[PDB]
Amino acid sequence: ELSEEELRQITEEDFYEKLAASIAPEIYGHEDVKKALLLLLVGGVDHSPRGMKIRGNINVCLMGDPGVAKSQLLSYIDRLAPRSQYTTGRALVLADQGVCCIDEFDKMMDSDRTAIHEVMEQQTISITTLNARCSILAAANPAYGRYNPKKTVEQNIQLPAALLSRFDLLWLIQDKPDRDNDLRLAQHITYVHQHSKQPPSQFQPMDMKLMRRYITMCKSKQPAIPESLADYLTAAYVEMRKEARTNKDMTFTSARTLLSILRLSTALARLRLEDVVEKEDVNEAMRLTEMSKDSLQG
Amino acid sequence: DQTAESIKNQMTVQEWEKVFEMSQDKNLYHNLCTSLFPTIHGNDEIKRGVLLMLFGGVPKTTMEGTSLRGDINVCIVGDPSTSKSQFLKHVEEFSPRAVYTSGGLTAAVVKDEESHEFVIEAGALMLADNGVCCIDEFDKMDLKDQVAIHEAMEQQTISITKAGVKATLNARTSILAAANPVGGRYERSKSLKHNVNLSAPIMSRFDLFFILVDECNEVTDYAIARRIVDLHARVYSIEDIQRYLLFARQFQPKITKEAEEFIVEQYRRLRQRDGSGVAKSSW
Amino acid sequence: QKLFTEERVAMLKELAAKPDIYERLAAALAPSIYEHEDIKKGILLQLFGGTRKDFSHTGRGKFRAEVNILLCGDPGTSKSQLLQYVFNLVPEFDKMNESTRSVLHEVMEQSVLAAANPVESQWNPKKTTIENIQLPHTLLSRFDLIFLMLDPQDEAYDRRLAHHLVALYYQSEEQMKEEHLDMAVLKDYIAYARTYVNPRLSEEASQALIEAYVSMRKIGSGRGMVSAYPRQLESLIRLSEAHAKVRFSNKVETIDVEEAKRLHREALKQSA
Ligand SMILES: Nc1ncnc2c1ncn2[C@@H]1O[C@H](COP(=O)(O)OP(=O)(O)OP(=O)(O)O)[C@@H](O)[C@H]1O
Ligand SMILES: Nc1ncnc2c1ncn2[C@@H]1O[C@H](COP(=O)(O)OP(=O)(O)OP(=O)(O)O)[C@@H](O)[C@H]1O
């Protein structure tokens, strides 16, 4: 469980970014990716308005050049999650009510990708149906050795477009030969191997057990979206769709985009221990979505 | 009972009168063709072939110990939705001994370990013995089924060896299998071998290989549409046809000398036609 | 069979007395959707449906009267909105597998409203509809109506559609009922037509259907054109039955057959 003293210690504002940075402190950078991983771990809020089932599970996919610590993040998420199973491309049922870490996601089989489509749309495996309420975290690498911004997402990483569109957030990590950044990374790695710990930072990293406790406490709350804020949702989505129809080259801001935005906002309000989704949650969800969009652009 | 007059004695007087009337009909061929398949429009040649299959031929056995075939088989190939399965459906409806399948077929030797006896459950071929075995989807059969069908057509037997129990079961029947050409479109440019996916011996054993073409005839389309609407809106009854068929099967005609010479002449003419290179034959 | 009140029966008959009742009821199903009148007419016919006839008297298999409709096109035409409106009003076709399509064909050997998407996520005018959806001839032949929904790249239209989408994500059903036709009246009309209206084929309607099938076969006899098949006649019969049920008529008229042929032509986009 938890104590009230811990509640005071973590009730300070901006604790969202604190928990984000507390995830895998060894990895240098990738702050927004860590925030997305935190949202995936906490997850959204399920709802049944008029019997309409609305799942809250969040799926995140990591893409980009090899050797940029993808497997490090995958392993850390797998270990920190209360229930998780790590597996390669070549199971899901055992991941129910947990996180399923699937590394080398591009080397799977389309026959199982049909079942993955079923799970991502229904959270069930119909053979008798078995529950598959598992949030999927996936990592992929380019099939040509490097990622080319010229080529599209499907060309660089051979995978059906729809399945790529299913994921709530898609991250593109590119390795750039910048002298200063390389020097900082080298200092970071040398410090880690020397002092057997991460370099000092502004905020003390959280412990794993306390992190699990607070994740469970946030999971307890189930906030709902008020209709007053929904008008700003109309303005935001109509502007987003106008931008999408401005240039159609990228993935359209389809209904899945809006549903993912709602889920992210509800999860953000859930972490803040609030029962009502506010303007800040929508702003943060839009910021994350636009950050992912800019990551895709090259 | 095999004597025709014996069954006539079993039959009533009115039945014998009806049989005599059917035997004396000059247009018995056309009347039987029309009554056997009333719903289907056109395709008279296939109806005639199916009727001849139903009547069958006279079996013989050589003094050398071999047995001569006395049954004929018909395979129908046509475009989709050309009512080929309707032929099988009507044949099964008319024939009480017909066994319809969709491509288990041979036998099932299930040992009753309680009594330690290998009781065999008859397959489709066994149940259709001394009759007609309608096999739709003939081109979808597995390799084992193809081998079994070829063996049945070549040796009119069914051999089974399960749990070290070798047995041979007789099976004498006619096959009315139907299948579609490869791709669903019959290419007149290609021969039957290219159009139909079937093993060579199975294709060779067949007779009266009828081929169906849609032909998109407008008058026939009007007739078909009117027939369908009327359905939404027989000279001889089936029982009479069955009685006459049994009576005819009780007969056993024999070849005559003049017919023999004419057969030899016609075979010579047919072989000369096939050897002629004016038009390549499909088989 | 609901005990339809005489006032309700009178109101339904007065609605049926209007010459625009077909178009009025087509629009009544979510008129906020930008045009798509023919698609709404098809969905209305699917809601009404044909007459259930038991043909065991003829020995032949009973003919299905339900109408199967396929909606084809790129995302962005708000198909999901109209589908949800239909589901509320009345309680992966792109990614179909070849093994699954074979299983479906075997099942069909013994009303479907499907939405289709392009494989490339964009409609190719140079490629035919069959190639764009990647579906077989056998499966496509089992859909009575196949509507081609094109997504025009117009900023005004896309703005209207996006605003309507967020309205659906924001507006409650109470405001939709207040702004548009009452859904209870439409439900009562549908129940009345499906229960009491049992149209019968007339001689003129029969001849019109037969001549329509003959004309379709003549079209199919041309080079490169799709050959007409007998299932098309049954589809036309079902569509005529549904259209007759729309007008509360107990007899199928030649107008019903002509409207069915027009709807089938507009769905297939034969003119282009
Ligand atoms: N911030 C960082 N950026 C880049 N590399 C880092 C960073 N932090 C650590 N590393 C180093 O990067 C390596 C991570 O390799 P890892 O096996 O995780 O690669 P990966 O990208 O997950 O692999 P792949 O995608 O090829 O299967 C380690 O050597 C680690 O020390
Ligand atoms: N002269 C005719 N030729 C063809 N079809 C006819 C004719 N008269 C009536 N029909 C009707 O047309 C339809 C023919 O299609 P049918 O379903 O019988 O095809 P099929 O032989 O089973 O096809 P497939 O096996 O290739 O799927 C049937 O409903 C049949 O009753």
PDB file of C-alpha atoms in Angstrom, chain C residues 55-211:
ATOM      1  CA  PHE C  55     -39.891 -21.991 -51.345  1.00  0.00           C
ATOM      2  CA  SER C  56     -40.003 -25.488 -49.827  1.00  0.00           C
ATOM      3  CA  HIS C  57     -43.177 -25.958 -51.883  1.00  0.00           C
ATOM      4  CA  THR C  58     -41.023 -25.847 -55.034  1.00  0.00           C
ATOM      5  CA  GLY C  59     -38.398 -28.173 -53.534  1.00  0.00           C
ATOM      6  CA  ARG C  60     -35.705 -25.603 -54.247  1.00  0.00           C
ATOM      7  CA  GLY C  61     -33.710 -23.937 -51.483  1.00  0.00           C
ATOM      8  CA  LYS C  62     -35.402 -20.998 -49.777  1.00  0.00           C
ATOM      9  CA  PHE C  63     -34.350 -17.706 -51.341  1.00  0.00           C
ATOM     10  CA  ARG C  64     -32.741 -15.159 -49.030  1.00  0.00           C
ATOM     11  CA  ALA C  65     -34.517 -11.796 -48.976  1.00  0.00           C
ATOM     12  CA  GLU C  66     -31.871  -9.880 -46.998  1.00  0.00           C
ATOM     13  CA  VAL C  67     -29.876  -7.271 -48.922  1.00  0.00           C
ATOM     14  CA  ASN C  68     -26.082  -7.221 -48.590  1.00  0.00           C
ATOM     15  CA  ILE C  69     -24.418  -3.818 -48.995  1.00  0.00           C
ATOM     16  CA  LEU C  70     -20.720  -2.983 -49.349  1.00  0.00           C
ATOM     17  CA  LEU C  71     -19.290   0.519 -48.851  1.00  0.00           C
ATOM     18  CA  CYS C  72     -15.929   1.096 -50.545  1.00  0.00           C
ATOM     19  CA  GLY C  73     -13.626   4.082 -50.269  1.00  0.00           C
ATOM     20  CA  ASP C  74     -10.812   5.811 -48.460  1.00  0.00           C
ATOM     21  CA  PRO C  75     -11.038   6.921 -44.823  1.00  0.00           C
ATOM     22  CA  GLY C  76     -12.316  10.435 -44.323  1.00  0.00           C
ATOM     23  CA  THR C  77     -15.870  10.056 -45.680  1.00  0.00           C
ATOM     24  CA  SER C  78     -17.348   9.483 -42.181  1.00  0.00           C
ATOM     25  CA  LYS C  79     -18.569   5.947 -42.873  1.00  0.00           C
ATOM     26  CA  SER C  80     -18.164   5.145 -39.173  1.00  0.00           C
ATOM     27  CA  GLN C  81     -20.583   7.962 -38.328  1.00  0.00           C
ATOM     28  CA  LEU C  82     -23.385   6.608 -40.522  1.00  0.00           C
ATOM     29  CA  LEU C  83     -22.691   3.067 -39.306  1.00  0.00           C
ATOM     30  CA  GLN C  84     -22.995   4.203 -35.683  1.00  0.00           C
ATOM     31  CA  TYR C  85     -26.180   6.136 -36.473  1.00  0.00           C
ATOM     32  CA  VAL C  86     -27.651   2.975 -38.007  1.00  0.00           C
ATOM     33  CA  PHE C  87     -26.581   0.813 -35.057  1.00  0.00           C
ATOM     34  CA  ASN C  88     -28.055   3.239 -32.519  1.00  0.00           C
ATOM     35  CA  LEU C  89     -31.234   3.579 -34.589  1.00  0.00           C
ATOM     36  CA  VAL C  90     -31.502  -0.180 -35.222  1.00  0.00           C
ATOM     37  CA  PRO C  91     -29.742  -2.706 -32.901  1.00  0.00           C
ATOM     38  CA  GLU C  92     -11.769  -5.547 -41.132  1.00  0.00           C
ATOM     39  CA  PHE C  93     -13.253  -6.164 -44.572  1.00  0.00           C
ATOM     40  CA  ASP C  94     -10.133  -4.545 -46.036  1.00  0.00           C
ATOM     41  CA  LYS C  95      -7.866  -7.044 -44.249  1.00  0.00           C
ATOM     42  CA  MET C  96      -9.743 -10.201 -45.275  1.00  0.00           C
ATOM     43  CA  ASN C  97      -7.517 -13.275 -45.544  1.00  0.00           C
ATOM     44  CA  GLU C  98      -7.697 -15.822 -48.353  1.00  0.00           C
ATOM     45  CA  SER C  99      -8.218 -18.704 -45.924  1.00  0.00           C
ATOM     46  CA  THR C 100     -10.925 -16.658 -44.194  1.00  0.00           C
ATOM     47  CA  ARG C 101     -12.512 -15.742 -47.536  1.00  0.00           C
ATOM     48  CA  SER C 102     -12.556 -19.432 -48.490  1.00  0.00           C
ATOM     49  CA  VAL C 103     -14.200 -20.257 -45.152  1.00  0.00           C
ATOM     50  CA  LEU C 104     -16.758 -17.504 -45.795  1.00  0.00           C
ATOM     51  CA  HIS C 105     -17.471 -18.878 -49.280  1.00  0.00           C
ATOM     52  CA  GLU C 106     -17.997 -22.351 -47.809  1.00  0.00           C
ATOM     53  CA  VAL C 107     -20.339 -20.860 -45.195  1.00  0.00           C
ATOM     54  CA  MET C 108     -22.284 -18.975 -47.877  1.00  0.00           C
ATOM     55  CA  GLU C 109     -22.605 -22.245 -49.805  1.00  0.00           C
ATOM     56  CA  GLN C 110     -24.917 -23.420 -47.009  1.00  0.00           C
ATOM     57  CA  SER C 111     -28.357  -8.302 -44.232  1.00  0.00           C
ATOM     58  CA  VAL C 112     -24.611  -7.621 -44.479  1.00  0.00           C
ATOM     59  CA  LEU C 113     -23.441  -3.991 -44.383  1.00  0.00           C
ATOM     60  CA  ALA C 114     -19.669  -3.941 -44.884  1.00  0.00           C
ATOM     61  CA  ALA C 115     -17.211  -1.046 -45.084  1.00  0.00           C
ATOM     62  CA  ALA C 116     -14.128  -1.466 -47.270  1.00  0.00           C
ATOM     63  CA  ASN C 117     -10.787   0.337 -47.398  1.00  0.00           C
ATOM     64  CA  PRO C 118      -8.011   0.438 -50.004  1.00  0.00           C
ATOM     65  CA  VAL C 119      -4.922  -1.685 -49.464  1.00  0.00           C
ATOM     66  CA  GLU C 120      -2.723   1.347 -50.212  1.00  0.00           C
ATOM     67  CA  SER C 121      -4.868   3.561 -47.918  1.00  0.00           C
ATOM     68  CA  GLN C 122      -5.535   5.726 -50.990  1.00  0.00           C
ATOM     69  CA  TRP C 123      -7.985   5.240 -53.852  1.00  0.00           C
ATOM     70  CA  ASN C 124      -6.229   4.700 -57.184  1.00  0.00           C
ATOM     71  CA  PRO C 125      -8.400   5.862 -60.120  1.00  0.00           C
ATOM     72  CA  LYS C 126      -6.198   3.896 -62.538  1.00  0.00           C
ATOM     73  CA  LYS C 127      -6.874   0.654 -60.632  1.00  0.00           C
ATOM     74  CA  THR C 128     -10.264  -1.030 -60.659  1.00  0.00           C
ATOM     75  CA  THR C 129     -12.391  -1.327 -57.531  1.00  0.00           C
ATOM     76  CA  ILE C 130     -11.758  -5.077 -57.245  1.00  0.00           C
ATOM     77  CA  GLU C 131      -7.992  -4.552 -57.373  1.00  0.00           C
ATOM     78  CA  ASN C 132      -8.167  -1.587 -54.982  1.00  0.00           C
ATOM     79  CA  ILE C 133     -10.002  -3.581 -52.301  1.00  0.00           C
ATOM     80  CA  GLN C 134      -8.267  -6.904 -53.137  1.00  0.00           C
ATOM     81  CA  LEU C 135     -11.430  -9.036 -53.004  1.00  0.00           C
ATOM     82  CA  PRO C 136     -12.491 -12.095 -55.037  1.00  0.00           C
ATOM     83  CA  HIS C 137     -15.161 -12.247 -57.709  1.00  0.00           C
ATOM     84  CA  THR C 138     -17.114 -14.851 -55.720  1.00  0.00           C
ATOM     85  CA  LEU C 139     -17.298 -12.718 -52.563  1.00  0.00           C
ATOM     86  CA  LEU C 140     -18.072  -9.487 -54.427  1.00  0.00           C
ATOM     87  CA  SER C 141     -20.840 -11.291 -56.325  1.00  0.00           C
ATOM     88  CA  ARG C 142     -22.523 -12.054 -52.977  1.00  0.00           C
ATOM     89  CA  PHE C 143     -22.940  -8.353 -52.146  1.00  0.00           C
ATOM     90  CA  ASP C 144     -26.206  -7.070 -53.599  1.00  0.00           C
ATOM     91  CA  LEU C 145     -25.073  -3.422 -53.572  1.00  0.00           C
ATOM     92  CA  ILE C 146     -21.479  -2.163 -53.666  1.00  0.00           C
ATOM     93  CA  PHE C 147     -21.255   1.606 -53.189  1.00  0.00           C
ATOM     94  CA  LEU C 148     -18.106   3.486 -54.238  1.00  0.00           C
ATOM     95  CA  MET C 149     -17.512   6.308 -51.747  1.00  0.00           C
ATOM     96  CA  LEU C 150     -14.836   8.680 -53.061  1.00  0.00           C
ATOM     97  CA  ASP C 151     -13.156  11.184 -50.744  1.00  0.00           C
ATOM     98  CA  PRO C 152     -12.755  14.568 -52.503  1.00  0.00           C
ATOM     99  CA  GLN C 153      -9.855  16.725 -51.339  1.00  0.00           C
ATOM    100  CA  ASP C 154     -12.004  19.821 -50.736  1.00  0.00           C
ATOM    101  CA  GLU C 155     -11.250  22.036 -47.743  1.00  0.00           C
ATOM    102  CA  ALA C 156     -14.887  23.086 -47.308  1.00  0.00           C
ATOM    103  CA  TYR C 157     -16.210  19.514 -47.430  1.00  0.00           C
ATOM    104  CA  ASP C 158     -13.452  18.180 -45.177  1.00  0.00           C
ATOM    105  CA  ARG C 159     -14.058  20.989 -42.680  1.00  0.00           C
ATOM    106  CA  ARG C 160     -17.785  20.195 -42.615  1.00  0.00           C
ATOM    107  CA  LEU C 161     -17.113  16.473 -42.176  1.00  0.00           C
ATOM    108  CA  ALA C 162     -14.598  17.050 -39.375  1.00  0.00           C
ATOM    109  CA  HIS C 163     -16.998  19.409 -37.604  1.00  0.00           C
ATOM    110  CA  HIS C 164     -19.749  16.790 -37.884  1.00  0.00           C
ATOM    111  CA  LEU C 165     -17.392  14.113 -36.541  1.00  0.00           C
ATOM    112  CA  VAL C 166     -16.478  16.143 -33.468  1.00  0.00           C
ATOM    113  CA  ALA C 167     -20.159  17.006 -33.060  1.00  0.00           C
ATOM    114  CA  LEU C 168     -20.929  13.284 -32.909  1.00  0.00           C
ATOM    115  CA  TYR C 169     -18.104  12.935 -30.376  1.00  0.00           C
ATOM    116  CA  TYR C 170     -19.647  15.857 -28.444  1.00  0.00           C
ATOM    117  CA  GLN C 171     -23.391  16.177 -29.147  1.00  0.00           C
ATOM    118  CA  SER C 172     -25.778  14.048 -27.112  1.00  0.00           C
ATOM    119  CA  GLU C 173     -28.576  12.058 -28.725  1.00  0.00           C
ATOM    120  CA  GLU C 174     -31.139  14.443 -27.213  1.00  0.00           C
ATOM    121  CA  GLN C 175     -29.918  17.353 -29.340  1.00  0.00           C
ATOM    122  CA  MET C 176     -29.770  15.111 -32.418  1.00  0.00           C
ATOM    123  CA  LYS C 177     -33.400  14.096 -31.859  1.00  0.00           C
ATOM    124  CA  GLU C 178     -34.449  17.718 -31.281  1.00  0.00           C
ATOM    125  CA  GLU C 179     -32.701  18.987 -34.429  1.00  0.00           C
ATOM    126  CA  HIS C 180     -33.632  16.128 -36.785  1.00  0.00           C
ATOM    127  CA  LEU C 181     -36.649  13.888 -37.303  1.00  0.00           C
ATOM    128  CA  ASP C 182     -37.791  11.922 -34.267  1.00  0.00           C
ATOM    129  CA  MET C 183     -36.248   8.456 -34.334  1.00  0.00           C
ATOM    130  CA  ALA C 184     -39.309   6.816 -32.759  1.00  0.00           C
ATOM    131  CA  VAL C 185     -41.437   7.709 -35.794  1.00  0.00           C
ATOM    132  CA  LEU C 186     -38.854   6.196 -38.143  1.00  0.00           C
ATOM    133  CA  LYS C 187     -38.641   3.042 -36.013  1.00  0.00           C
ATOM    134  CA  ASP C 188     -42.435   2.734 -36.080  1.00  0.00           C
ATOM    135  CA  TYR C 189     -42.431   3.184 -39.866  1.00  0.00           C
ATOM    136  CA  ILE C 190     -39.767   0.494 -40.272  1.00  0.00           C
ATOM    137  CA  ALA C 191     -41.630  -1.940 -38.011  1.00  0.00           C
ATOM    138  CA  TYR C 192     -44.924  -1.304 -39.816  1.00  0.00           C
ATOM    139  CA  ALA C 193     -43.366  -1.833 -43.250  1.00  0.00           C
ATOM    140  CA  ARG C 194     -41.532  -4.993 -42.182  1.00  0.00           C
ATOM    141  CA  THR C 195     -44.618  -6.424 -40.463  1.00  0.00           C
ATOM    142  CA  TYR C 196     -47.790  -5.559 -42.391  1.00  0.00           C
ATOM    143  CA  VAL C 197     -46.413  -4.712 -45.856  1.00  0.00           C
ATOM    144  CA  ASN C 198     -45.902  -7.949 -47.830  1.00  0.00           C
ATOM    145  CA  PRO C 199     -45.682  -6.873 -51.489  1.00  0.00           C
ATOM    146  CA  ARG C 200     -46.378  -9.351 -54.286  1.00  0.00           C
ATOM    147  CA  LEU C 201     -44.924  -9.393 -57.792  1.00  0.00           C
ATOM    148  CA  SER C 202     -47.241  -8.157 -60.528  1.00  0.00           C
ATOM    149  CA  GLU C 203     -47.145  -9.248 -64.160  1.00  0.00           C
ATOM    150  CA  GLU C 204     -45.767  -5.872 -65.262  1.00  0.00           C
ATOM    151  CA  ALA C 205     -43.167  -5.969 -62.482  1.00  0.00           C
ATOM    152  CA  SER C 206     -42.263  -9.542 -63.440  1.00  0.00           C
ATOM    153  CA  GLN C 207     -41.747  -8.556 -67.077  1.00  0.00           C
ATOM    154  CA  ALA C 208     -39.720  -5.513 -66.017  1.00  0.00           C
ATOM    155  CA  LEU C 209     -37.469  -7.697 -63.853  1.00  0.00           C
ATOM    156  CA  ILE C 210     -36.984 -10.220 -66.663  1.00  0.00           C
ATOM    157  CA  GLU C 211     -36.182  -7.489 -69.193  1.00  0.00           C
TER     158      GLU C 211
END
